[PDB]
Amino acid sequence: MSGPERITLAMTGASGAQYGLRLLDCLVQEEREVHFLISKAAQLVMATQTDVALPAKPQAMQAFLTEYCGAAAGQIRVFGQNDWMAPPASGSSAPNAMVICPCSTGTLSAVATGACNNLIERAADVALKERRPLVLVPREAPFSSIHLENMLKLSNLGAVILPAAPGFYHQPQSVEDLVDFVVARILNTLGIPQDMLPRWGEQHLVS
Amino acid sequence: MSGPERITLAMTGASGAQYGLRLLDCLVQEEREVHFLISKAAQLVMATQTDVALPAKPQAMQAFLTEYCGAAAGQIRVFGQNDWMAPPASGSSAPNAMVICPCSTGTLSAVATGACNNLIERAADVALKERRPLVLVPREAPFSSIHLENMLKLSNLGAVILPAAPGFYHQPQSVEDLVDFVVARILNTLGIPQDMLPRWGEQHLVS
Amino acid sequence: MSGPERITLAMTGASGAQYGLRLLDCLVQEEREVHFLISKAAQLVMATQTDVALPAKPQAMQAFLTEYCGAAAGQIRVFGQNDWMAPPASGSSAPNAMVICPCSTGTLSAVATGACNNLIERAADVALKERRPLVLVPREAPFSSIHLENMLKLSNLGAVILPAAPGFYHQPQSVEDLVDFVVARILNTLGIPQDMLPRWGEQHLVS
Amino acid sequence: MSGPERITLAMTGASGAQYGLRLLDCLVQEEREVHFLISKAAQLVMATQTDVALPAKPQAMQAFLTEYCGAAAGQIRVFGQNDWMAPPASGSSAPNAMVICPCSTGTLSAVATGACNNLIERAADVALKERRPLVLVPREAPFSSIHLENMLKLSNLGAVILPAAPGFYHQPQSVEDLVDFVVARILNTLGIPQDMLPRWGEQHLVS
Amino acid sequence: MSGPERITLAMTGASGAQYGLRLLDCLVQEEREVHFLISKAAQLVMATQTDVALPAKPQAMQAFLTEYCGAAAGQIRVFGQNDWMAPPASGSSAPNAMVICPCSTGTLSAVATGACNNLIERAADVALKERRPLVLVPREAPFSSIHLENMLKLSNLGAVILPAAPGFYHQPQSVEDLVDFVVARILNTLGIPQDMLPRWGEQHLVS
Amino acid sequence: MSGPERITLAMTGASGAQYGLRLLDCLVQEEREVHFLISKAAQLVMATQTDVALPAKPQAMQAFLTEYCGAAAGQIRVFGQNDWMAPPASGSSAPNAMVICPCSTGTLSAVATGACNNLIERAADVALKERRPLVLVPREAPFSSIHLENMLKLSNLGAVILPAAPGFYHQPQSVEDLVDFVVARILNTLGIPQDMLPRWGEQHLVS
Amino acid sequence: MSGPERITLAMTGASGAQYGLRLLDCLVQEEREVHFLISKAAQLVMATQTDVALPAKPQAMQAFLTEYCGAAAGQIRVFGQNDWMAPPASGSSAPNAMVICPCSTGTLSAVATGACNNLIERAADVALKERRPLVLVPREAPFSSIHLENMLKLSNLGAVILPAAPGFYHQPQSVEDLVDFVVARILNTLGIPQDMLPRWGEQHLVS
Amino acid sequence: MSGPERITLAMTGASGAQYGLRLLDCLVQEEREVHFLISKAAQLVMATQTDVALPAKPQAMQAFLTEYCGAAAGQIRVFGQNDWMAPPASGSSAPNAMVICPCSTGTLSAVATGACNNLIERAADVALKERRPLVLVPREAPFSSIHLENMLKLSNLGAVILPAAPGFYHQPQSVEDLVDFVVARILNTLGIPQDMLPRWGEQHLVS
Numbered sequence A, B, C, D, E, F, G, H: 001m002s003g004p005e006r007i008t009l010a011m012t013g014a015s016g017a018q019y020g021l022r023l024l025d026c027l028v029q030e031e032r033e034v035h036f037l038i039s040k041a042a043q044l045v046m047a048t049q050t051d052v053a054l055p056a057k058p059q060a061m062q063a064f065l066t067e068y069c070g071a072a073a074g075q076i077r078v079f080g081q082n083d084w085m086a087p088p089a090s091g092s093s094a095p096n097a098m099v100i101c102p103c104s105t106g107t108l109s110a111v112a113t114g115a116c117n118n119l120i121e122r123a124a125d126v127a128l129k130e131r132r133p134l135v136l137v138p139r140e141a142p143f144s145s146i147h148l149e150n151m152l153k154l155s156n157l158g159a160v161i162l163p164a165a166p167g168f169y170h171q172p173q174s175v176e177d178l179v180d181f182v183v184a185r186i187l188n189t190l191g192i193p194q195d196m197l198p199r200w201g202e203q204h205l206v207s
Ligand SMILES: Cc1cc2nc3c(=O)[nH]c(=O)nc-3n(C[C@H](O)[C@H](O)[C@H](O)COP(=O)(O)O)c2cc1C
Pocket: A011, A012, A013, A014, A015, A016, A039, A040, A041, A042, A044, A045, A048, A049, A103, A104, A105, A106, A107, A139, A140, B167, B169, C084, C085, C116, C117, C118, C122
């Protein structure tokens, strides 16, 4: 397989739960293992703004998502926000790529300053210290200088800042086509195959 | 009226021509005067990726857009990329708010470094030196450190960096609802009335 | 009216609950709408160091403060520390000026780094990204370099750093006259009328 | 009226006394109140290089300028260099816009570093802490790196750096037309009406 | 004795003469030697805003303060603003702790930039080069970025920035109790005994 | 194969056309696909200073280079300076390593500031945002501070700055041996096999 | 002769064509060789705002200026905006001092960032890398922070930033006397004799 | 003579001994005095990679080089790596220009940080403190960020960073023509006559 075997996928409380769910579904279809983390605010976002009824407790959530995605047994692991026994809490874990999708401005801040107040924050701290892939998908507008300084610091350290800013050059016909644009760019960044967004200019031989 | 009487609206060659057109249409409906600028690459973007057939020459373009938006005579002015006689080229002009929507990474760079290679770039140079509103709507993913340093410099100087990153909390049902989300935030930033996005929590009295 | 129609007033756990209460009372008398936020530590400060018995729950608190200030019905809204449905959580809300009075060093830190761990912190994140007024009233001594770097970053971004450092040039005769000095400066910063502190030198014609 | 009711106009010892006098005269004609400050070196500049015989003492100076400009009684207030009873010494004063025209490199330095050795310097310190308009009109050539760092620091904080660098695009026929160019830009910056410099391109409809 | 034998106490022209006088009185009661410096603006502040009639000349002032505080003969030394023969002008002097209380923003600026235009400024220059204690008690609101950068530079070099920002956790009943709060913190910083402010939590054994 | 399948090779107007041609020829022999870009100034450099007669138009150029290198059909693609349909214009393209050989100081500047005025500049903007290899081969002497700051910024972001500074430790006998030294280092940087420069010390077992 | 034998004089599109022409005329009278460069925007400025009818093409322009100034044959050389065969394009050229008079903010930007999009920009890049004199004569008001950062960077590298900010201490009676003031300062900076501005205080023996 | 009478020529252990020898030979032919310094690693480079058999000891080396270059008696002085009696060790010496050709990355580091571990390093420390010419000829590829930061620091202080990066615009036919290109640029930087590289465009009159 091209790309990582295991992805830590953290959802935080920005608008854009759709991107996180679609990414989870694509990662499952490419037979990757997913370590799934979700914040309390992202639970509120999904509950109040989508019609996905995600159970609260980690075991019930793991069962629901496994069904939602047609995943294989053990393929999706769910860990709670203080579960320091989970692999992402330590750099001695097996290597995983991490994506925070969507990434709230508060989680962006925590990651940039090294705050470790929950497993999502610690898992990012670990990704950075181990030089493992870390992709952040912020969804905010406007971006303040605080936001931008936090993104720049992390980009300078090798994190990928991939805003939830879809393009229109594939002639999107639905919300889903926009969601898929961003998910495709994430998978491209991770080096995981995707067929939602063609390779620009692949057939163009001469100008 | 709340907000500026005159907006300089510059379209550049990022993906997202839809946002610029929708904004132009909303600004016309709020009876503002619009000084319209468009780059050669943004012409290519509109031509090759929308089904708006925008004429090439400024006078023909002014006629087309006036029709497209139902604008009043003289309400939309169009200026070409080297027309230094246009009001935006000088700070002695009547005050206008400026929005670059969408804003390519190259135009973001030019603005942040003070390059003045065309009227769009000069018009931004002028907005900043006069302390007149300047809103940039970048549409790129990922954002590199180069992009982020350019946005941060400009945000620190009082420009508003408003990425084309729509939210989902109004339950969007179409591409157009996403486009309108970003346009609404622009109009909110400018202080111009809009009814596309409700005021969050306006009826919420107690927690 | 001169000045903002709506103020988000956040009280945090620094010494100086008196300033926050006096400001709330003045804002009510100038017929402004107040969105009131208070941290758990500021509850402890008021409980253990004032003889204002503030109820714990938001609805009971809203009733108490409305009585305390002689406010009109709906004039004071109270929101709890995780109530993301409240207007201050989103920039799509109606514009409000925000004052954090008093501002603990921990809340100063959170605001300067973009941490968003409660509604007060998020509401400040929003104020800054929207370019809406944000006034911080720290009460600490000494100020460390950490404190000072956090204040400087925010001042450079357009927040007003207004320490709880009263002046003596109005010949204060009581604690209340000192409290009113600081409240007056806040209201002056906000552009809201006040008659507690005269306009210096207004009658002085020549030197 | 558009623009501020009251302007603090400080003249310091750079070459260009003409600009300060012309500005004072225009501000009087637009019926603004002017709080006039002048340094000892600027007195020497006016005395030795203009044929305006400005009296030394504040009361005599106030009488002379009131005559010179055709001002109304009390319209021009004059304050001496240590008169801390004057409104500009305190932020509790009524709001004024401040212009230092011309601005010597030493006064530029004092303002940028926060030195408060006289009323002009203090009045600028106050303008900056209150977020009130502050315009500096330096007249020096070359600009050293010291000068440029001082201007940049202040520009970054929201002061307007408006060098005494007139333009030629109105076809100036006299020294006075050059002086008026700079005065016009000052008044434009302040938001005060002026008819000396037309609005560039106001009649230009299309390119 | 705990703490320094000799304190250089400089009063400058900020509002808050009360703090400087109260500190002088406490230092006298703890049998310390005080080298007293006062600026011309601080003389104006005391004259116009307190009912302490401080004589102008150093010898007359030394006599007055010695009486005011019940000091011993030679215990208070007074030095004028250009008296370079005074111990504080040279680092070869016997070691003293220095406190500038209150500290105007102009004196803060001078100290941070190394300006040495009077004995107070030089005495601070010396304190910093000798690594002797230097405490600054600014009294200003708002603090501008200029103020904050000057405080941060000095704090980073080991000066103590102790704003005149009293706390309310000792249940102050008068202006004097607020003044004493700040004076207590100064004496704590200096390591000099004081009984005005109890030791927080000294009797609290367990949570 | 070790190393990238596809290289974007941009030639710009520095002295050293020989290096770009030799690299193109080596890349062809290692059966890589080459997306070839050349600036107008680099055309002038090749025309006026080499005896390679490179046709002007992209299709004619593609035919000429395919012959020059003995390339396979479609192996060399040529794109013009505004051809935004070419793969290098978008990060959604298939991954390529990019080398700018030689790299003029103006192209170095454009890349470091994010200017995107042609396809070479955009292609570098894309390489950096996608974290794809980007190698710059400047040929200038002296290097100014402007040059050096631009190289440092890009090196800090992960671009490889490989000046056209050949070594002499392989005992070069001709200009071609010097050219091959630099080309070898490029291919080593890219991870592409080369046999022009031996592996230093590969047979040295002990000191 | 004192000063340089050869000056590269670049005119760019700021207001102030008069200064460039007057300087050219003075340089000719001091029998210097002038390599003359002019941008397209500066052609528009001269055409639309002076009554100097400057031919478009370099040879016709060289003939016109030679007549205008009474220059000797070959004394004025004119080079077009892409003529890389001209001496200023290379540091291997004979040494020249360079002056950009007037200097637009866009040309200031290009020089400060190292952009080399035309011969003027390259010629400045070369001046800086060779440590040859480079004088920039900006004419803008206000100066933004972008402008000021660009000037500071270049001043720190040894370029002379000489704004078109004339002085009044020679009692100017006409526009021409103001123009000559700035030209005199340029010639003083270059070390070329001039008799338009006396040497300040040359006859003053004692104070 | 144009240029310096005395050059300190230091050879260090980068590849490119040829440049140092050729420069020494040209300096001798222009009848300059040369103070020659060579590191132990540069001895190894010359020994193992050239067929110049340079004696080890300073006196034997001085004799050999005097013969090699056809120098006059005393024209070449050789000093060993700890000979602090040599003129270059002190700024009280007669002024010399210094060139380090070639300049290893370790010697570049030492110079940039002020390390003074041998006479070459000290001689550069002295050149910089005396503001005497200092030219560094690094020969490395790639340049790391460490290298680039060290070059930038020194360039900012007025050292000339002249990489061993020859140009091809004189149609080089041999290794020697490339070596001579770099040597010519060095001599141009020093202001010493050379006829190896023509003056670009000297005969080009018009574009
Ligand atoms: C409906 C809803 C939408 C939100 N949308 C955003 C958003 O788009 N961007 C953002 O930064 N925060 C948004 N927030 C706020 C955060 O959820 C909040 O700041 C929270 O503290 C984030 O916590 P977390 O980072 O642990 O998920 C939203 C909250 C809610 C309730």
